[PDB]
Design a protein around this ligand. Structure first.
Ligand SMILES: Nc1nc2c(ncn2[C@@H]2O[C@H](COP(=O)(O)OP(=O)(O)O)[C@@H](O)[C@H]2O)c(=O)[nH]1
Ligand SMILES: [Mg+2]
Length: 592
């Protein structure tokens, strides 16, 4: 194909050929990450009809893209961990023999890139200055993928450079699975009814076929950053996690970094862009999705965000509820996927301010206030925006040695039973709280271990073991304290006991105070939990009885919880570590 490519990495140069020969594109193109390229690609995408260019008074350099109603997220059921032995995928994952899967996908790939450009998209996960940065190359026939990868990863010339002549990298292959015939006119959003998102842990490879959407197609965002990364983590001494990285800044003038793993729809994005409500506190973000954490030479755990932009859910995002998010998209350079077009070339979505009377919806049809029965924006529609535009981005965001983590937080939605905040008794108890994370639920109480249920690249039980092991072998003075929060406990009339949002900084305050040995906490069966007295309520219009209710550890309710933990633990099967059963036994012993 077109190989006058700017590299002497033979291994790469082979692989590109081998793939081209199988997929039969018209040309191969290597992407460089330049502004100049970005515009070409956006122009080609606007000509194709995939992108609409937004009215540029209102938004610098921003676009709207509408997908086929058939690839719109997801497809965890078409997502596979193809390790050699089935046990090393484990019961949270979909497995298939690797040889059987190669057969299926080599068939699928044969001639799939036909009447289309094959982009070779190199990229770096993590800051770029690192000694041994974690790099990858995504081949894809989708331009939308190229553009989106430019914001979400450090893409192009720089990463290609970091690879040398023989530097290792993750081989990541994508196709939309819609080959053209030589006459044929394309569609705005090519995809297929057949979809596979396949992860090969031992060879550190991702094969994606069939979808052009999100985490099925932008291969760094979950395929690399959690699935392959976690497997790397296992083998190499670190942790790849579904965590926001928050930097909380006290009245003067200390920085505390937190890592928090909530499942999606439970509040990562809010907590990561928290505006504290107590005078003198600031907050800055390093990330709101993925945290890579390693132990420092002395002797702490350091976090880095492997990504380079935000890929947020649009619906419900607004100036009241997330103005930091909003200022970030205002700076433009943004691609909106499946939101609505306003009468004057702007974008809108349910929850945004205004009440436009007419819209063109995400299917391209006319939409009307108090009339059309469907949402104007797709309810999982997205924005894709550079991290560097975020006004509260912490200055250490591009810093390869990371930030020391003081606390690690786990949580989800629980209407009952789980208090607003609980501190772990120790590392091994910490892992068990993570390991047992429950959220209601569905797609009524789902277990979603460290908010990683759909993202583990290997067996859950071994993943827990890995967590225990990194703790056993470290100075417990220097480990992060672990906490378990719940913003969502409800009273008898069904209102929230806790107001949450901004005011969650009160809970973070207690966590800091606890680190600076200056707040109290009762020992309870599930861990240490503050009395209302122990929390800074000054300035808050809320009933102290509500707050104590949020804080209750009720022996009866937790007795009801133990069989659900147990089922879940049985479901984890033969790799369930002793530590976790020990902690389960302990929790049971203290509840009687
Ligand atoms: N009651 C309550 N709801 C919250 C809180 N934080 C987030 N939410 C709700 O959870 C949903 C969005 O959380 P988001 O930050 O988008 O979660 P993410 O999907 O985990 O990033 C919205 O419906 C929010 O209003 C909170 O502290 N209290
Ligand atoms: Mg949930």
């Amino acid at each position: 194909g077109l190989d006058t490519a700017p590299t002497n990495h033979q291994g790469l140069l082979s692989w590109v050929e081998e793939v081209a020969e199988l997929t039969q594109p018209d040309r191969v193109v290597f992407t460089d990450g330049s502004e100049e390229e970005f515009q070409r690609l956006c122009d080609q995408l606007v000509e194709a009809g995939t992108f609409i260019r937004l009215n540029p008074e209102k938004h610098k350099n921003s676009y709207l893209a509408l997908s086929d109603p058939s690839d719109v997220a997801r497809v965890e059921s078409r997502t596979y961990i193809c390790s050699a032995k089935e046990i090393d995928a484990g019961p949270t994952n979909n497995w298939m023999d690797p040889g059987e899967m190669r057969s299926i996908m080599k068939d699928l790939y044969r001639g799939c890139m036909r009447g289309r450009t094959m982009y070779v998209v190199p990229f770096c996960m993590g800051p770029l200055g690192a000694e041994d940065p974690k790099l990858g190359v995504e081949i894809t026939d989708s331009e939308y993928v190229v553009v989106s990868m430019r914001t979400m990863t450090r893409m192009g010339k720089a990463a290609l450079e970091k690879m040398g002549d023989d530097g290792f990298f993750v081989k990541a292959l994508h196709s939309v699975g819609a080959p053209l015939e030589p006459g044929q006119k394309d569609v705005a959003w090519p995809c297929s009814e057949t979809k596979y998102i396949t992860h090969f842990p031992e060879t550190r490879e991702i094969w994606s076929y069939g979808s052009g959407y999100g985490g099925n197609a932008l291969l760094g965002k979950k395929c690399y950053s959690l699935r392959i990364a976690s497997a790397m983590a296992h083998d190499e001494g670190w942790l790849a996690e579904h965590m926001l990285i928050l930097k909380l800044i006290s009245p003067e003038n200390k920085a505390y970094y937190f890592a928090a793993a909530f499942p999606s729809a439970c509040g990562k994005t809010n907590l990561a862009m928290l505006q504290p409500t107590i005078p003198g506190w600031r907050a800055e973000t390093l990330g709101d999705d993925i945290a890579w954490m390693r132990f420092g030479k002395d002797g702490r755990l350091y976090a880095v965000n492997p990504e380079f932009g935000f890929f947020g859910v649009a619906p419900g995002t607004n100036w009241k509820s997330n103005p930091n998010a909003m200022r970030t998209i205002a700076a433009g350079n943004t691609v909106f996927t499946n939101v609505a077009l306003t009468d004057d070339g702007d974008v809108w979505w349910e929850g945004l301010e205004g009440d436009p009377q007419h819209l063109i919806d995400w299917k391209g049809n006319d939409w009307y206030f108090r009339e059309t029965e469907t949402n104007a924006a797709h309810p999982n529609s997205r924005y894709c925006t550079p991290m560097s535009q975020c006004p509260i981005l912490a200055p250490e965001w591009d810093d390869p040695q990371g930030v020391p983590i003081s606390g690690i937080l786990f949580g989800g939605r629980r209407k009952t039973t789980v208090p607003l905040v609980t501190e772990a008794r120790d590392w091994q108890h910490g892992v068990f709280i993570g390991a047992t994370l429950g959220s209601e639920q569905t797609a009524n109480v789902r277990r979603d271990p460290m908010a990683m249920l759909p993202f583990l690249g290997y067996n859950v039980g071994d993943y827990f073991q890995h967590w225990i092991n990194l703790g056993k072998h470290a100075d417990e003075a220097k480990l992060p304290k672990v906490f378990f929060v719940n913003w969502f406990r409800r009273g008898d009339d069904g209102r929230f006991l806790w107001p949450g949002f901004g005011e969650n900084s009160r809970v973070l305050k207690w966590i800091v105070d606890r680190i600076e040995h200056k707040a109290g906490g009762a020992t309870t069966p599930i861990g240490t939990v503050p009395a209302v007295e122990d929390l800074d309520l000054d300035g808050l219009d809320v009933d102290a009885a509500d707050v104590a209710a949020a804080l209750a550890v009720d022996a009866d309710e937790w007795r009801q919880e133990l069989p659900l933990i147990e089922e879940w633990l049985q479901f984890v099967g033969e790799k369930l570590p002793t530590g976790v059963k020990d902690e389960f036994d302990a929790l049971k012993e203290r509840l009687g």
